[PDB]
Amino acid sequence: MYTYIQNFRFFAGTYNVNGQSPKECLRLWLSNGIQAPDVYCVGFQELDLSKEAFFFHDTPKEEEWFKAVSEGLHPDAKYAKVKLIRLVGIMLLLYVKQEHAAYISEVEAETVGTGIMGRMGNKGGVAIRFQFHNTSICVVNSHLAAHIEEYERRNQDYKDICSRMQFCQPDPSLPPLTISNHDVILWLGDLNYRIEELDVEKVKKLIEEKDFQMLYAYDQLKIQVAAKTVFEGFTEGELTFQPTYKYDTGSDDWDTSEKCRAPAWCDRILWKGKNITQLSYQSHMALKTSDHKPVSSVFDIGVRVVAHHH
């Protein structure tokens, strides 16, 4: 057989929904003035903040948000639901245009909790891996530890998801699949990294000034990536949108509660692999159900397709 590179459009979305049910149309996130994607990868955090969900019960939030995503996908294509995976409030959905579904195989999904006692699902990651034509792809959705001062725990949460996440395989001879053994890796989530050093007032001023390059020099993820403690070999696109946390629900105002939180680029998308180009990296201010804003990225990804023999 012969293979060649064919480009496909992948949308990746992350949204911390602060335990709410969906109240708004999700087109503003999922299909807001873009071409119909070939593949949709849509991730949530804090789908359900209840004690019942914490002890691993089913939640109606799963279907509510799944239906809401399905209704917000681009109207020009019928999308096939490939896979859903959830651990407590961390949920990842994979859809492909119907015409591409026959070329999806080896779908596996797994979860790793890294929250309470290093094991519960209040924080952690979920992942769907699959083969599209002859290219292997792993999409990870993580919710890492909160708070400015817990950066080391975030680093450790990342390492723990990487070491413990194992996928089934067709061959039991071989060692199980890890996240890193894929041609393409897309990692998204509420990674929860904050702005070091600067005080809340200085952070908010820089944002009003739109000096994102300067604010970014103090971003914990940037610093940790430079120090090689996390996301080794991954790329993130330039942040040109304002911090996505923390807002008063129903508004675009910064948190006016007692905790008065410092803004942060909590919500991030990164990637690793050959033949990837980022076409966009954006937040979506118009959605106000949550104290976070959703984030999206569209990629052109080269996929190995089998040439037809005649």
Q: Which residues bind Mg ion (CB under 5 A)?
A: 18
Segment contacting Cl ion by CB under 5 A, of 116-124, 142-150, 236-244, 286-294: 286-294
Residue 25 engages Cl ion in binding (rule: CB under 5 A) = no
* Smallest gap from residue 12 Cβ to Cl ion (A): 16
Tell me the binding residues for substrate: 46, 122-123, 245-246, 259-261
* Smallest gap from residue 129 Cβ to ligand PIF (A): 26
Query: Could you give the dihedral angle defined by the CA atoms of residues 182, 238, 286 and 198, in that order, rounded to the nearest 10 degrees?
Result: 120
Q: Which residue is nearest to ligand PIF (CB)?
A: 122
* Smallest gap from residue 191 Cβ to Mg ion (A): 14
Give whichever of 108 and 157 is closer to Mg ion, judged by the CB atom. Answer: 157
Give whichever of 18 and 155 is closer to Mg ion, judged by the CB atom. Answer: 18
Which of the residues 123 through 152 are near Cl ion (CB under 5 A)? Answer: none
Let me know the angle formed at the C-alpha of 156 by 108 and 127, rounded to the nearest 5 degrees.
15
Question: Coil, helix or strand for 100?
Answer: helix
Exactly one of 86, 97, 123, 284 binds Cl ion (CB under 5 A); that residue is: 284
Residue 54 interacting entry, from ligand PIF, Mg ion, Cl ion, none, C-beta within 5 to 8 Å by type: ligand PIF
Residue 292 engages Cl ion in binding (rule: CB under 5 A) = no
Instruction: Return the number of other C-beta atoms located less than 10 Å from residue 84's C-beta.
Output: 18
Pairing label, strands 79-87, 90-97: antiparallel
Binding site for ligand PIF (CB under 6 A): 49, 51, 54, 115-117, 120, 122-123, 146, 246, 259, 261
Contact present, 141 and 268 (Cβ < 8 Å): no
| Residue 13: CA count within 13 A, CB half-sphere | 30
Give whichever of 135 and 155 is closer to ligand PIF, judged by the CB atom. Answer: 155
User: d(Cα 37, Cα 95) in Å, to the nearest integer?
Assistant: 10
Cα–Cα nearest to 137, from 126, 128, 146? 128
Give whichever of 44 and 132 is closer to Mg ion, judged by the CB atom. Answer: 44
Question: Coil, helix or strand for 174?
Answer: coil
Q: Which residue is nearest to Mg ion (CB)?
A: 18
* Smallest gap from residue 284 Cβ to Cl ion (A): 4
Give whichever of 5 and 286 is closer to Cl ion, judged by the CB atom. Answer: 286
* Smallest gap from residue 72 Cβ to Mg ion (A): 22
DSSP output for 111-137:
EEE-SGGGTSTTSEEEEEEEEETTEEE
Residue 286 engages Cl ion in binding (rule: CB under 5 A) = yes
* Smallest gap from residue 25 Cβ to Cl ion (A): 11
Give whichever of 8 and 158 is closer to ligand PIF, judged by the CB atom. Answer: 158
Q: Which residue has the tokens 């194992």?
A: 166
Provide φ and ψ at 204, rounded to 5°.
-65, -30
Note the residue count of the chain.
Answer: 310
Give whichever of 116 and 168 is closer to ligand PIF, judged by the CB atom. Answer: 116
DSSP output for 22-33:
P-S-THHHHSSS
* Smallest gap from residue 242 Cβ to ligand PIF (A): 17
Contact residues for 1 (Cβ-Cβ < 8 A; gap 6+)? 306, 307, 309
Contact present, 129 and 182 (Cβ < 8 Å): yes
Residue 286 interacting entry, from Cl ion, ligand PIF, Mg ion, none, C-beta within 5 to 8 Å by type: Cl ion
Residues that bind Cl ion (CB under 5 A): 28, 284, 286
